[PDB]
């Protein structure tokens, strides 16, 4: 099972919450797209936070209101794939404190 494989997986289990509408799409096309050429045809139990890091990063640059979207998209899907059994334990993508020292919030 791969990233790209289990996050389809996550929107189908979701599509009748989904409409028929495009925000299904619109979650499949942003992960193939960011996550796609990094962390899609990775397993889904394979991804690391090193991982999720380096594609983030980069984004932080030029869209910081979409690395913070995504991260929380990348968040539901890997919960949903612990539950689901996709790679148990807990997610790279939970994050103990993000942008803590400097800013975080509280």
């Known amino acids: ?15 009748s919450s989904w409409k028929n509408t495009k925000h299904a799409d619109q979650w499949t096309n942003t992960i193939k797209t960011y996550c796609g050429p990094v962390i899609g045809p990775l397993s889904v139990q394979d991804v690391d936070t090193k991982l ?3 594609v983030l990063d980069p984004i932080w640059e030029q869209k910081p209101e979409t690395a913070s979207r995504l991260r929380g998209r990348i968040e539901s899907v890997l919960d949903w794939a612990t539950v689901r059994g996709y790679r148990e334990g807990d997610n790279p993508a939970r994050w103990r404190g993000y942008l803590e020292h400097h800013h975080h919030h509280h």
Not at 1 to 15: D, G, V
């Open 1 to 15: 099972m791969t990233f790209s494989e289990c996050a389809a997986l996550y929107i189908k289990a979701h599509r």
């Open 52 to 54: 999720i890091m380096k």
